[PDB]
Design a binder for this molecule. Structure first.
Ligand SMILES: CC[C@H]1OC(=O)[C@H](C)[C@@H](OC(=O)NCCCOCCC#Cc2ccc3c(=O)c(C(=O)O)cn(C)c3c2)[C@H](C)[C@@H](O[C@@H]2O[C@H](C)C[C@H](N(C)C)[C@H]2O)[C@](C)(OC)C[C@@H](C)C(=O)[C@H](C)[C@H]2NC(=O)O[C@@]21C
Ligand SMILES: [Mg+2]
Lengths: 215, 122, 37, 175
RNA sequence: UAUGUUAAGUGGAAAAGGAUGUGGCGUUGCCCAGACAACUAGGAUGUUGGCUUAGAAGCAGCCAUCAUUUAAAGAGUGCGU
RNA sequence: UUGGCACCUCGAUGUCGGCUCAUCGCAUCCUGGGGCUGUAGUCGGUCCCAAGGGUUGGGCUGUUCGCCCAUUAAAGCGGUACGCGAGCUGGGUUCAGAACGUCGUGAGACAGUUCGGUCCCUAUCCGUCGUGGGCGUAGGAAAUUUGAGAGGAGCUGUCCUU
RNA sequence: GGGAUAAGUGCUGAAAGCAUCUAAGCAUGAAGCCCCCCUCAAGAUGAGAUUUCCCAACUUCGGUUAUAAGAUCCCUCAAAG
């Protein structure tokens, strides 16, 4: 029903009614603007696109994503908006209620909703078999030479091959993760911040896509 | 964090001066326990006399572990020694002159005779 | 329900029927209900 | 097939509209519309209808008698009506209505509610005898089965929703 | 092409055995006097008589198992202890 | 499983237990649905459908196994070169030393014990886990995307109430 | 929480005027199947969809410069490695 693009600032704690330490993740949602209203007969599925943050305007000889390029200026000027930095869309919302060009405000959420925050994880880089996959590693003594490597990767002559999905070393992080059934403790309308009980995925200064639980 | 092969002091005049644990009841694969959790244990030092004697297998409930426990407000209670109290399979102690403090979390586990026969609930 | 490679009437009140491919016995004694065969 | 050929049917103050395959019967209590077997033909004389098998194959002898009794059930049911009676035996086992639905109290720590449907009516009697009524014999049968499946009879004290006059094999388990 | 067979994907892995699956060829005992169905038509008699057995009168077991009230009838074809 | 056959491998196919990692069957150990019972419900027994998931920690032996002590809802049976040593150990077994019992006149011998006894290899290809570049998608681009498919989860206890 | 099922339970129902879960049809029914939930996914060579941006001027005939829109080189960096 509701959706807002925000970014993660950090974590703190709130002493709620009945003195309970509620661990919280503060999220800064500001100038969320609808840029389109997808429709079933025009695009095949009804949804709305929200742009977050604020890039600078086009300049000739730009060398960074700080400034908008001509292609993006046009997309945002059709919604009379400023070029934005992060653009996502929401399907769960009902399109008739919204309108192209409106601001999505932190106050969309009331205290005590149930939301799903979808971000991207923090990068751990190239990581071994046991940190990436939770594997028990071998003996550290008693004359062992098998400390952290993964064990057998297969059988023998039957399946003279390694099967797909064998949990081997690679790059951890950089995965979209959706924590479910979190809730908001307070919405602040002036500093533009939605506080969410628990913890959310991602580095500090990241991007979170808060919407209403699908369960 | 109390696991098997952990030696605990007894906090009763039941007859056992110090005991060690074998299992932590409560689930397949359960490995650890804290205040308010029951275990199986065999005494290793008994008083001359007492109802419980050396080498017996007994139920018991943890009180005042040194890892301690978080409370819902962000308050933590820690202690300087592990300790335990023997039970009679009805959440009831054996001695009646329990020594040392006891946490307030034993109230919930309905170990009320343990909380009533205690120097300090905390 | 007995499932045996030999469905045969056990009582005189026993009727062999063929339902859904399988030769069964349906009787008023629930003990004599049988299935395969 | 004796059922089929021999036994001729008897339309009684009803209107059996044999429109090709799809028949219709309408009378005092309502209208029933079924689609009967293709190969079969029908000969309706005055106040009588006769079904005819095109051959004598096992195939055209079994279908024959089947949908000769499925017409009778329609005409006999659109004129006389079909009703099934269910009893409820047991201390505290009751039966009460709720307006187009029936609530059952059969010792289930929860009330069970059977909602009614088109062309089907329900009623109770002395809070024990439920009665399902309607024009289709296969709706009165379907519903009455649904209302006995709530708690079918048990073998020790007979407690449960039993069809009126249904032998409940009673075992004699002892304390 | 002609004439038939299967309904299981049989064809396109087993067997003793089990079966109102279906096709063929005989043989047959019954049937318009009207066999076979549930044909909702009667169902019991002196009489369990005798051994009557835990008393038990279609069950813990020898059956001595007589004629029919009768269109049709058995000291009960039979479900029972 | 114990075997029988001697068909590939003696210009070498490392053999037993344990560790790491599993994967598959179902004749199912638990959990779900049922027919039953010499099932009153809890109880158990039997058979059927079911393989989605789950299916402990220790003492003793090199042990697999088995017994025992505590638990658990359960502590399943098998295949995979009795899965897996170019992933690990090397306790057992199978070299040279030694010793006891036995056999041999003797050198020596025993699948009889016992103490000790070197586990090499920088990955070419297929395979697998990640991560780039090229090109194609009838113009060149920036962003948002539906989902053909594919993968992951999938367990369950106790208490209270009725 | 849907949808289709397994053993099973039925409803109406004849072959076989009776019966009967079955043959037509039509019900219900499991941690199982499908969807539902999380993630990857148009190299899905079938290469999909939506919005926007760029748009001339020599040819002697494009097998054409260089430029748009857009990027990169290079350099300061890390929420990434
Ligand atoms: C360091 C690099 C060198 O590697 C090696 O030494 C490794 C360690 C060696 O691994 C093994 O020991 N077995 C694995 C351990 C198995 O223990 C069980 C307990 C035992 C025993 C035993 C039995 C009999 C005798 C024996 O009777 C006797 C005598 O003298 O009579 C001498 N003792 C010592 C015996 C001891 C290689 C790899 C070895 O191969 C393997 O041996 C097996 C016989 C067969 C294996 N397969 C074919 C199944 C084979 O793979 C060789 C033979 O080396 C001795 C390798 C050959 C090629 C070499 O010579 C190279 C050049 C090595 N020489 C050197 O300098 O570099 C080396 C690479
Ligand atoms: Mg060779």
């Amino acid at each position: 029903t509701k959706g807002i693009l925000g970014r993660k600032i950090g974590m703190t704690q709130v002493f709620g009614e009945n003195g309970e330490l509620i661990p919280v993740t503060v999220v800064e949602a500001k100038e969320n603007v609808v840029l389109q209203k997808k429709t079933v007969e025009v695009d095949g599925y009804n949804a709305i696109q929200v742009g977050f943050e604020d890039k600078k305007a086009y300049k000739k000889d730009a060398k960074s994503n700080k400034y908008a390029n001509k292609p993006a200026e046009g997309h945002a000027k059709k919604a009379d908006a400023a070029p934005k930095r992060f653009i996502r869309e929401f399907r769960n919302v009902d399109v008739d209620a919204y309108e192209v060009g409106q601001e999505v405000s932190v106050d969309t959420f009331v205290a005590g909703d149930v939301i799903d925050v979808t971000g991207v994880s923090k990068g751990k880089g190239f990581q071994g078999a046991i940190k990436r996959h939770g594997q028990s590693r071998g003996p550290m003594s008693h004359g062992s030479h098998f400390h952290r490597a993964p064990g057998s990767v297969g059988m023998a002559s039957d399946a003279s091959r390694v099967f797909k999905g064998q949990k081997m070393p690679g790059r951890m992080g950089g995965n979209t993760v959706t924590v479910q059934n979190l809730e908001v403790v307070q919405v602040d309308t002036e500093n533009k911040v939605i506080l969410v009980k628990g913890n959310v995925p991602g580095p500090k200064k990241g991007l979170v896509e808060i919407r209403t639980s699908i369960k | 964090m109390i696991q098997q092969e952990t030696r605990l002091k007894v906090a009763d005049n039941s007859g056992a001066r110090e005991v060690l644990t074998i299992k932590v009841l409560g689930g397949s694969g359960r490995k650890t326990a804290n205040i308010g959790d029951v275990i199986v244990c065999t005494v290793k030092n008994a008083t001359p006399g007492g109802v419980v004697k050396k080498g017996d297998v007994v139920k018991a409930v943890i009180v005042r572990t040194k890892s301690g426990v978080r409370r819902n407000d962000g308050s933590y209670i820690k202690f300087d020694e592990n300790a335990c109290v023997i039970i009679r399979d009805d959440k009831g102690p054996r001695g009646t002159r329990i020594f040392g403090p006891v946490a307030r979390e034993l109230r919930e586990g309905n170990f009320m005779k343990i909380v009533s026969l205690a120097p300090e609930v905390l | 329900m007995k499932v045996r490679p030999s469905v045969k009437p056990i009582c005189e009140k026993c009727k062999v029927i063929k339902r859904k491919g399988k030769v069964m016995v349906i009787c008023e004694n629930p003990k004599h209900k049988q299935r395969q065969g | 097939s004796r059922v089929g050929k021999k036994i001729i049917d008897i339309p009684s103050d009803v209107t059996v509209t044999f429109d090709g395959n799809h028949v219709t019967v309408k009378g005092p209590k309502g209208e029933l519309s079924r689609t009967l077997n293709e190969r079969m033909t029908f000969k309706q004389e005055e106040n009588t209808i006769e079904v005819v098998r095109p051959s004598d194959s096992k195939e055209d002898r079994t279908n024959h008698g089947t949908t000769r009794a499925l017409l009778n059930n329609m005409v006999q049911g659109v004129s006389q009506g079909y009703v099934k009676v269910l009893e409820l035996v047991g201390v505290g086992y009751r039966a009460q209505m709720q307006g187009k639905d029936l609530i059952l109290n059969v010792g289930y720590s929860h009330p069970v509610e059977i909602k009614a449907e088109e062309n089907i009516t329900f009623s109770v009697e002395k809070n024990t005898v439920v009665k399902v009524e309607g024009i289709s014999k296969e709706q009165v049968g379907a519903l009455a089965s649904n209302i006995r499946s709530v708690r079918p009879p048990e073998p020790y004290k007979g407690k449960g929703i039993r069809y009126q006059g249904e032998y409940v094999r009673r075992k004699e388990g002892k304390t």
